[PDB]
Structures are given as C-alpha cells and as structure tokens.
Design a protein around this ligand. Structure first.
Ligand SMILES: C[C@H](CS(N)(=O)=O)c1ccccc1
Ligand SMILES: [Zn+2]
Ligand SMILES: [Zn+2]
Ligand SMILES: [Zn+2]
Ligand SMILES: [Zn+2]
Lengths: 69, 73
C-alpha cells in the first residue's frame, strides 16, 4: 500500500544516515575526539587533521561499537 | 498489507537498537572509553564504573554526535 512506501522511505533514510559522510559506502564506526562528531568510517577518519563537521582539531579517533552495526 | 507489518517491525527494531540498553528510554549518545562500546544515554553512562557489554573499567565517557540523533524539535 502507500503506507508500505512511506515505511520503506523511513527505513532507507535511517540506513543512509548511518553511512560515512565522506565515502558514502561504509558504516560509521569512528568518533573524532574530543569534539565527538561520529560521522566517518575508520578509513576516512584516519586521514583527517580537523573534524569535517565543526573544524575542531582531531586529537585522536576512537573506534565505536554500536548496536546498529 | 502483511509487508506493511514486516516493515513496521524492521523500523521498530532499528529504532530500539538506537535506545540506551540500560534505561530503554533515551537515545544512545555516549561511548565508554577505552573499550568503545556505545550503548548508553549520558545519564546511565555517568553511573556505570564498568562497561555493561564487556565489563572493562570505564576510564571516561565521550559524548557522541550521531547523524541519526532526533529530538522533540
Ligand atoms: C535493550 C535494547 C536497546 S539495544 N538493542 O541494546 O541497543 C532495547 C531498548 C528499548 C526497547 C527495546 C530494546
Ligand atoms: Zn568512509
Ligand atoms: Zn567535530
Ligand atoms: Zn539510559
Ligand atoms: Zn565495553
């Protein structure tokens, strides 16, 4: 029904929001510290000096284990 | 249809996986360091000396800003 289409759209947008903002292919599993932006996969995060969201210096990258993984 | 019910169930399980594993009421927004388990809201994370998944000692809690986050706004 049209309701099935609405739910498919919500599921798709939620799943897309869990993907890396840089490569768009891998799941987000890394946090820039200390700002806390958790927007990249480990490969894209490893190469950044500053947070791509807030420009704060990245002191280190913390790997995150999320239940949604 | 039956597929509407299947999709509602998938959506519910995905939304539940984003809720704190301790209180079940607030969104996950905190990481236990150094283990990395990201399973609690900031209120439950502040009260745990050991990670509830792996029992590693919590040295500190890192707040996480996730693109999936939602609010009353
Ligand atoms: C305990 C889980 C959360 S999870 N999968 O550990 O992150 C849960 C929370 C709220 C309702 C149902 C189930
Ligand atoms: Zn990436
Ligand atoms: Zn940042
Ligand atoms: Zn909680
Ligand atoms: Zn842990």
């Amino acid at each position: 029904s049209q309701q099935t289409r609405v739910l498919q759209e919500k599921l798709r947008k939620l799943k897309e929001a869990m993907l890396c903002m840089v490569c768009c292919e891998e799941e987000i599993n890394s946090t820039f510290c200390p700002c806390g932006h958790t927007v990249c996969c480990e490969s894209c995060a490893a190469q950044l000096q500053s947070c791509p969201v807030c420009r704060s210096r990245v002191e280190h990258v913390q790997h995150v284990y999320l239940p949604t993984h």
